[PDB]
């Protein structure tokens, strides 16, 4: 049997077998219990709706993302995510396949152990391994050097890798993008009188965060032309018939990635965390970290990136240095195409942690 790559998204959990095209299942991670009393008599209602069904049944449930700030809320809901994914999307039994699971870089111990341990006893997989989402994006882009960005709602990361070794002393985790950008967009859309305070309605905010937002070339000059009469406004239509016109806030929300002072948080922008991680690496290596700046994750899919990022880095970086920023299409599925390449390779079959070895070793094998 065929191995299964299942990505523990922050979004947007992604699932598909090993090779060779695209993921089979992608869905918004949400679990939602019903906040109102039923009067139908069937009864016909589920105890907890997962996505996609919880995104079709908005407004009668209370949506709860099971992974928040890069860590799982409880494994009771997480197990339901897994069960739903394997059985009613992929249509496969875990006993049939070796699996490949993903994690986030700088995640607290003992949450990789507890995960691995529960998943082996609950789903009875014959072998498993847990890879960080950032490393996998190297394979997806066909690179062997560069700084890797796993940016999902709501934890971004900046990991530098050099042919083909990782540098522990320069790894940066920012809790900045993207769920706090969702919350910030909701705070500056209230300023235009649209009240979307409720949990369900927050998903609609997320959808306009995808579609209508853009990044400026320079903030001050976009603000200048905003003061002018020329329309930057785009009109969105809402499920109850309402028409929302956003303009100024449209470029304000993504600009936060370069200026976190908009949220009021002390942390520095992607601009400077890129530079400061490069300048924590040895002198000879710095040469090839420039021009292997590879963006990844769905929250980097705004149009004005990477050429904003490019212009800003080129201004702070040493003169006459070659800087190219690598941003392909499909960054949301980058991780999955990474994992797919990995699990197909020899000899990594023998790098998987198998059940008998796990049973003897216990949680200490993980690291």
């Amino acid at each position: 049997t065929t191995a299964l790559v299942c990505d523990n998204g922050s979004g947007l959990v992604k699932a598909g077998f090993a090779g060779d095209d695209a993921p089979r299942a992608v869905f918004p991670s949400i679990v939602g219990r019903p906040r109102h009393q039923g009067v139908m008599v069937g009864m016909g209602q589920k105890d907890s709706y997962v996505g996609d069904e919880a995104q079709s049944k908005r407004g009668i449930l209370t949506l709860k993302y099971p992974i928040e700030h890069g860590i799982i809320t409880n494994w009771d809901d997480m197990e339901k995510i897994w069960h739903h994914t394997f059985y009613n999307e992929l249509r496969v039994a875990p006993e049939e396949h070796p699996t490949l699971l993903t994690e986030a870089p700088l995640n607290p111990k003992a949450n990789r152990e507890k995960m691995t341990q529960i998943m082996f006893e609950t789903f009875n997989v014959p072998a498993m391994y847990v890879a960080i989402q950032a490393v996998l994006s190297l394979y997806a882009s066909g690179r062997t050097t560069g700084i890797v960005l796993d940016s999902g709602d709501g934890v971004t990361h900046n990991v530098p890798i050099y042919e083909g070794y990782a540098l522990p002393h320069a790894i940066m985790r920012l809790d900045l993008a993207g769920r706090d950008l969702t919350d910030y967009l909701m705070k500056i859309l209230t300023e235009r009188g649209y009240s979307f305070v409720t949990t369900a309605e927050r998903e609609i905010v997320r959808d306009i965060k995808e579609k209508l937002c853009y990044v400026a070339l320079d903030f001050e000059n976009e603000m200048a032309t905003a003061a002018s009469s020329s329309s930057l406004e785009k009109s969105y239509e809402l499920p109850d018939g309402q028409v929302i016109t956003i303009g100024n806030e449209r470029f304000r929300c993504p600009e936060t990635l370069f200026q976190p002072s908009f949220i009021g948080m002390e942390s520095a922008g992607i601009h400077e965390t890129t530079y400061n991680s490069i300048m924590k690496c040895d002198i000879d290596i710095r040469k090839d970290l420039y021009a292997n700046n590879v963006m990844s994750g769905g929250t980097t899919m705004y149009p004005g990136i990477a050429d904003r990022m490019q212009k800003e880095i080129t201004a702070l970086a040493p003169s006459t240095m070659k800087i190219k920023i690598i941003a392909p299409p499909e960054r949301k599925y980058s991780v999955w195409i990474g994992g797919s390449i990995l699990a197909s390779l020899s000899t990594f079959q023998q790098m998987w942690i198998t059940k008998q070895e796990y049973d003897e070793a216990g949680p200490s094998i993980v690291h």
Partner: protein, 331 residues
């Protein structure tokens, strides 16, 4: 194919290759703007249908993979057209002639000669298998009955070249999957997994001076029935790598020309290139096992190819390269 200007990654065509594409797309019956996308992108779906660009080295291998697909189906169309000039009335029993090149090798051997000598080693296995069966039913026919005879095996040379995960063709097809393929990593991986065995040594172990000039990561020596044959590893992976993918396979089949569509009668992306050489040969070896056999070995007596000249320094080399001496060892 040059490198794209940072915009979405990938590769673009060179400006010197613009009029060269215009004079090529009307021979293939396709549009020049759709062919430029298809030679640079990986088309997939998210179900919208997106276009994800490829790297420069993957586009040079994909452009040559289109030429190794169009000419491959053109030779299969010539043979099928010839078989339609004399259609068979019916089928039942058959007497056929298999003709192929013998054990051919040069001073520095290539990937093309590696597949010839691998094909002759599998045919050498079936050759000695049919000789032992004829001798066992000769002894019975003369009333001598059964007796013990020692058989020589060459399965260890076959497992070296083609075994799953550990074979030489299996490492070669895996190297194509890596994010950065190398030929120095391919050579070192052969003596990584096969550190012992007598059918394989380093080039410097050879008595020949020309082979002693080859560095450890530049080649290898594989012993076959006709002796120790060295192969260099430069360009070996490049010649094996083929990358015909969806975005280009489903474009040459979609041609506006009718003769082109007649030539071509998700998953798997890059496909398995080192496996097509093993798979097609197994369709002939089990057909040879299902029939009887009549082995006719052909001798060239002299280099000039002129009448009444015997060269015993060239005839003896063909007795040892025909498998004849091996069968005399068996007897």
């Amino acid at each position: 194919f040059e490198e794209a200007g940072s915009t979405s990654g990938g590769c673009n065509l060179k400006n010197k290759s613009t009029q060269a594409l215009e004079y090529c797309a009307e021979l293939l019956g396709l549009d020049q703007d759709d062919l430029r996308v298809s030679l640079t992108t990986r088309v997939m779906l998210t179900t919208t249908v997106i276009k994800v660009p490829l790297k420069v080295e993957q586009a040079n291998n994909a452009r040559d993979a289109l030429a190794k697909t169009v000419y491959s189906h053109l030779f299969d169309h010539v043979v099928n057209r010839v078989n339609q000039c004399f259609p068979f009335e019916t089928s039942s029993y058959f007497i056929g002639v298999l003709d192929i090149a013998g054990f051919e090798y040069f001073e520095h051997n290539s990937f093309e000669q590696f597949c010839i000598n691998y094909c002759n080693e599998k045919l050498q296995q079936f050759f000695n298998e049919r000789i032992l069966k004829e001798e066992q039913e000769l002894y019975q026919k003369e009333g001598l009955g059964v007796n013990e005879v020692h058989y020589v095996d060459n399965q260890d040379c076959i497992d070296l070249i083609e075994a799953r995960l550990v074979g030489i063709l299996d490492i070669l097809d895996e190297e194509n999957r890596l994010p950065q393929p190398s030929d120095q990593h391919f050579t070192s991986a052969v003596h990584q997994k096969h550190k012992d065995h007598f059918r394989l040594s380093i080039p410097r172990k050879s008595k020949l001076a020309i082979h002693r000039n080859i560095r450890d990561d530049e080649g290898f020596i594989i012993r076959h029935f006709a002796g120790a044959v060295c192969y260099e590893t430069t360009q070996f992976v490049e010649k094996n790598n083929d990358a015909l993918h969806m975005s280009l396979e489903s474009l040459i089949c979609e041609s506006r020309d009718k003769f082109i569509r007649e030539l071509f009668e998700g998953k798997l992306s890059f496909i398995s290139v080192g496996n097509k050489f093993k798979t097609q040969l197994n369709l002939l070896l089990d057909k040879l096992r299902s029939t009887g056999a009549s082995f006719i070995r052909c001798i060239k007596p002299n280099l000039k190819m002129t009448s009444h000249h015997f060269e015993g320094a060239q005839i003896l080399s063909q007795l040892q390269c025909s498998g004849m001496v091996s069968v005399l060892d068996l007897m």
